[PDB]
Design a protein around this ligand. Structure first.
Ligand SMILES: Nc1ncnc2c1ncn2[C@@H]1O[C@H](CSCC[C@H](N)C(=O)O)[C@@H](O)[C@H]1O
Ligand SMILES: [Zn+2]
Length: 624
């Protein structure tokens, strides 16, 4: 029930259905192939197999383009029903049948096998949703000889780069800035997938060190050319000397095998005539297990690896297989949290405030996976780091040993700090937080600390504030807006059930890495709530009007904290005079997308209750 309704919520895959270029490009591959089979089949009858049919959109496009029979397969049963409803209430009802099975389980589609297979079954890493087996087994079992598939062919490109920015998402943080600081040893990093909108990297934040290299070619029309595990050593020519901080990755697929019509995931700065924004697909960043340097105009090799679902890259003469996180950091922290710690360790203004606040004092740190106490140890007489998570305690233990910070103690519970400290310092940062306001756990550890030592116990930060701002994003809004009619097909049935299963199983406010989404801001940041650092934690409730909404399509929200004399922002860092906001890359911000009833209003009313009882903030948006 709840697992079933949550997955119906995901089923839109953000902007997938509204990806105009995706839709054009599959339409084009179907026109080309249906027209070949129109000529080739002695009777002119063309059987299309659409695998992964979702709403049935592609099947509608096949039948309207003149396929005589379309069979559509959807493994996810509720989307199977959705499709059945949509296609059976359309003019092509008679031509289209929906079977709710995974294509791999089907054994015959009856009576005839397919002339053509269309499948949109790809994610950012191309192969990560099963494409390989889906095609290979559909060709073995479900297709005529010379079956044509849309798309027919695909490539995966990597580009080496030197980038301080990207390094920050991967480096084990270095308390003192030099290498060879190796606090935790050497680590590969995970083979978790790091998806990023590389188009929003500013040109100064990276440098390409070679032309794109073709890591893999796939061919989705020949059974035998689809091999699940492969490794190839690949060659290129540096056009700059530098170090390979990261490997940018993306793919492109050829819709009809003509070398002309493509979905191309190349970033805006490297896809000059086939670039369209989207979110359900993006580009990806991979890291080499060890450092690799490169000089022009030298030849270098990257070893290119994949299994059925996954890609990874290794150096020559190092061993080929997939490398996991061994330091515990890459597997515990999200990418943006690694960036957060590396950024904090390099932030001279932050470090100065921490020294001035700690000097000669016993400091206690609260947080969960917060590294602050390691900085407080420079100047503090004593640091008690309180961290409830065992694995972060083990990490901190390795850092204190490695950097010989003998004035630091690490303990598990706030109620175990029996000596009273001079100051409590926090970011605050708790790894558990899905929202910038979920770091409000802070208020409760403070309540406990003031109950145990007194109410005049010094604590920093001493004020937190929830803020919001109206923004007009260029594109991001389409992850959330209603699908309505698409390619002339009414898909509103999908919106009703998608609405329902989002209403029930989803949060009102989304979470997004806003630095990755271009927009312009339409008003001043506004304060919503303000949190004093008190004896007792109190519920609070407010109602604020957010004007300027008629030219905006979203409301970002974030926390700011007054840490001694400085201000820490988990979201907005500044706004250019042109109105372009800059967002902290070490956190996800909250963004609300005005519900469809509200698309039009020139101002919305924001309601928020911080509920002492849950530690949470509920929002509703409406009225005015
Ligand atoms: N081998 C398979 N057989 C049937 N459904 C599959 C499948 N692999 C993935 N899926 C389903 O197919 C979908 C991919 S999303 C693409 C949907 C549709 N063709 C469109 O382009 O709009 C998801 O609904 C997933 O449930
Ligand atoms: Zn690691």
């Amino acid at each position: 029930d709840y697992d079933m309704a949550q997955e119906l919520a995901r089923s839109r895959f953000g902007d997938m259905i509204l990806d105009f270029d995706r839709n054009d490009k599959f339409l084009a591959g179907l026109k080309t192939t249906i027209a070949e089979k129109k000529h080739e089949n002695t009777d002119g009858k063309v059987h299309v197999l659409d695998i992964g049919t979702g709403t049935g959109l592609l099947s509608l496009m096949a039948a309207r383009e003149g396929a005589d029979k379309v069979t559509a397969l959807e493994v996810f049963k509720p989307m199977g029903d959705c499709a059945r409803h949509i296609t059976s209430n359309s003019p092509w009802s008679d031509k289209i049948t929906v079977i709710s099975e995974r294509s791999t389980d089907v054994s015959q589609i009856g009576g005839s096998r397919a002339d053509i297979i269309v499948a949109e079954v790809f994610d950012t890493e191309l192969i990560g949703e099963g494409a390989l087996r889906t095609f290979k087994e559909a060709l073995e079992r479900l297709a005529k000889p010379g079956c044509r598939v849309v798309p027919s062919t695909g490539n995966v490109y990597i580009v080496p780069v030197e980038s301080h920015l990207l390094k920050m998402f991967n480096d084990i943080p270095r308390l003192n800035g030099e290498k060879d600081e190796e606090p935790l040893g050497r680590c590969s990093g995970t083979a978790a997938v790091f998806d990023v909108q590389l188009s929003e990297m500013k040109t100064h934040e990276f440098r390409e060190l070679s032309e794109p290299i073709v890591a893999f070619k796939f061919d989705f029309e020949h059974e035998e050319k689809i091999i699940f595990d492969e490794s190839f050593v690949r060659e290129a020519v540096a056009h700059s000397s530098g170090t390979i901080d990261a490997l940018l990755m993306w793919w492109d697929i050829d819709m009809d095998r003509n070398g002309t019509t493509f979905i191309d995931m190349g970033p805006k700065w490297k896809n000059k005539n086939n670039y369209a924004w989207r979110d359900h697909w993006m580009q990806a960043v991979y890291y080499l297990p060890e450092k690799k340097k490169v000089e022009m105009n030298q030849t270098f090799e990257i070893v290119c690896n994949h299994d059925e679902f996954s890609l990874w890259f290794s150096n020559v003469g190092k061993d080929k297989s997939r490398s996991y996180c061994v330091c515990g950091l890459h597997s515990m922290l999200s990418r943006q949290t690694v960036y957060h710690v590396n950024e904090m360790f390099e932030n001279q203004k932050f470090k100065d405030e921490v020294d001035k606040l700690s000097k000669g004092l016993h400091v206690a740190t609260v947080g969960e996976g917060s590294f602050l106490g390691l900085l407080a140890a420079k100047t503090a007489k004593r640091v008690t780091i309180i961290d409830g998570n065992e694995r972060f305690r083990d990490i901190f233990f390795k850092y204190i040993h490695y950097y010989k910070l003998t004035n630091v103690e690490i303990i598990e519970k706030v109620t175990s700090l029996t000596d009273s400290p001079d100051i409590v310092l926090a970011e605050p940062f708790y790894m558990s937080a899905m929202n910038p306001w979920n770091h409000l756990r802070f208020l409760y550890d403070v309540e406990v600390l003031k109950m145990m030592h007194g109410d005049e116990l010094r604590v920093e930060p001493h004020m937190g504030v929830l803020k919001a701002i109206p923004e007009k994003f260029e594109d991001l809004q389409n992850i959330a807006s209603d699908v309505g009619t698409v390619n002339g097909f009414d898909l509103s049935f999908f919106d009703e059930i998608s609405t329902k299963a989002r209403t029930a199983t989803d949060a009102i406010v989304d979470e997004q890495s806003l630095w990755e989404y271009a927009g312009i801001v339409k008003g001043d940041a506004v304060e919503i709530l303000r949190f004093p650092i008190d004896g007792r934690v109190s519920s609070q409730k407010c109602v604020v009007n957010i004007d300027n909404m008629s030219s905006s399509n979203a409301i970002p929200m974030w926390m700011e904290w007054e840490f001694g004399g400085i201000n820490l922002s988990t979201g907005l860092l500044s706004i250019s005079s042109a109105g372009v906001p800059e967002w902290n890359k070490g956190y996800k911000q909250g963004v609300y997308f005005p519900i469809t009833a509200l698309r039009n209003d020139k101002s919305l009313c924001l309601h928020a209750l911080f509920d002492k009882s849950t530690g949470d903030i509920n929002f509703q948006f409406g009225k005015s």
